[PDB]
Amino acid sequence: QSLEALNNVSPQNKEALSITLHYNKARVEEVSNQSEAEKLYSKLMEKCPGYTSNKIRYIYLLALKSNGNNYADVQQLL
């Protein structure tokens, strides 16, 4: 319902609220299915590379999948 109502948001805050809602939906997916969570994580990272929680969660999921074989990514994020 929040995503449906996002169409009525003012354009100034529309980008920020869309990023927030997409992050929340990606969290719900990560609870349900990690693949869609990672997809939305990539979508938001392309949309806003400056955000940290998205990158943290994406790298954390990658480390879970790669058994901590992305130490370079963690160092770069640090």
Binding site: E15, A16, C48, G50, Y51
Partner: peptide, 6 residues
Amino acid sequence: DDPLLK
């Protein structure tokens, strides 16, 4: 520096 991030 991004006003969006702020």
